[PDB]
């Protein structure tokens, strides 16, 4: 908020899909979303098993 950015999470579970040419694109697709918009500050979600 203080840096005036766009908060975007990362869910590692849905980053792997199956398409034609887009199969492995979805993993790193979040990199492009941080290109067109510079104020990214990417955050990571779904770390590990908390029980």
């Amino acid at each position: 908020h203080h840096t005036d950015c766009k908060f975007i999470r990362v869910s590692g579970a849905e980053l792997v899909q199956k398409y034609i040419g887009e199969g492995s694109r979805m993993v790193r697709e979040l990199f492009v979303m941080a290109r067109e918009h510079a104020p990214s500050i990417i955050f990571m979600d779904e770390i590990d098993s908390i029980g």
Binding site: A13, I20, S24, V27
Partner: protein, 363 residues
């Protein structure tokens, strides 16, 4: 006058008559679809996104070489005839591909590795920059190199300087991204990697940090041990069974390559095995001056003093102290970093940041 009547006059007359036909040839909607197969009779089958099926005749504005199974062409509204082929612009498929043009790197920052640089430069940069050496001699350059050594030697910057001098396509394939959740997508990914690299230029193929199949570690992606071979052997068949004249250069590097299947390494195609170790006190003096070249240092700070303190450190550990020393002075906001900041920075890196294990030691 004389030539303009036999050149410009017949050309402008045919172009105006051709544009008048484009209204009857190319309609308003201009439906498209996916081309399946072509026949020597100038008849093909095209499937629109609504999944219909038709059989029509191949019209002008296309040739037999431009038609390939699995491409997209242009159709007609009422007659559904093929108008022509539509080329695919703005990258073949993916826009986030590591392909770039002339990145920023030089040989001054990688200095100290010249003993290991001479081997990789002759097998990669030399045939691309000076092809007349290998072609006129008759020898065939290797199709790739492989790197091995202790972590922290900066093996990433070794191949980064090649992309700038060669001024060609530079691709990167993460070793952890080789596998896929859905079974069967592993070889489908690797098949598209060499497909794009083979169409445009010899370029470069660089694979770094391969954890694939090593000691499991991925329980969210299940291959059933059968996807292990199908994904790995796909990389092997493209480096052996695939017909190539030596243009494709595939580079593989990670912390430990001994755990990988040596059959996947495909010996005899890669003639360069480069080893990396920890630099001595003479090499660290040159490496320390690289990171401190753009840094403002005080008068009491000596480069030979910090190198003597450094013990059992790699190239990445030297840059860590220069970065940490800049952050310590950043809190106090000093233009020139004093000597008291380097003393506190070198102690915190080798302690909290770098955890030195025993491994093989026996003092």
């Amino acid at each position: 006058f004389v030539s303009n009547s036999e050149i410009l006059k017949p050309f402008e007359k045919k172009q105006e008559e051709e544009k008048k036909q484009l209204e009857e040839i190319r309609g308003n909607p201009l439906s498209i679809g996916t081309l399946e197969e072509i026949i020597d009779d100038d008849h093909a089958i095209v499937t629109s996104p609504t999944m219909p099926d038709y059989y029509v005749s191949i019209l002008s504005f296309v040739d037999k070489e431009l038609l390939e199974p699995g491409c997209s062409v242009l159709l007609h509204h009422k007659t559904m005839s093929i108008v022509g082929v539509l080329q695919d612009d703005a990258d073949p498929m993916v826009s986030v591909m590591k392909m770039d043009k002339s990145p920023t790197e030089s040989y001054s920052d990688i200095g100290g590795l010249e003993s290991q640089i001479q081997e990789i430069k002759e097998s990669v940069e030399l045939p691309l920059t000076h092809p007349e050496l290998y072609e006129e001699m008759g020898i065939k350059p290797p199709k790739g190199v492989i790197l091995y050594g202790a972590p922290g030697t900066g093996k990433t910057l070794l191949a980064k300087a090649v992309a700038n001098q060669t001024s060609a396509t530079f691709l990167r394939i993460v070793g952890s991204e080789l596998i896929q959740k859905y079974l069967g997508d592993g070889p489908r990914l690797c098949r598209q990697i060499f497909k794009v690299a083979g169409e445009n230029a010899p370029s470069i193929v660089f694979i770094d940090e391969i954890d694939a199949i090593g000691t499991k570690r991925y329980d969210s992606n299940s291959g059933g041990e059968r996807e292990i071979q199908r994904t790995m052997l796909e990389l092997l068949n493209q480096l052996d069974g695939f017909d190539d004249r030596g243009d494709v250069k595939v580079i593989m590097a990670t912390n430990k390559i001994e755990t990988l299947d040596p059959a996947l390494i495909r010996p005899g195609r890669i003639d360069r095995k480069i080893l990396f170790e920890n630099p001595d006190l003479s090499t660290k003096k040159k490496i320390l001056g690289i990171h401190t070249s753009k840094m403002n240092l005080s008068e009491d700070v000596n480069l030979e003093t910090l190198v003597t303190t450094k013990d059992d450190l790699s190239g990445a550990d030297i840059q860590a102290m220069c970065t940490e020393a800049g952050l310590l002075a950043l809190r106090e906001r000093r233009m020139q970093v004093t000597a008291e900041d380097f003393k506190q920075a070198k102690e915190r890196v080798m302690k909290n940041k770098v955890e030195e294990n025993l491994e093989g030691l026996y003092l």
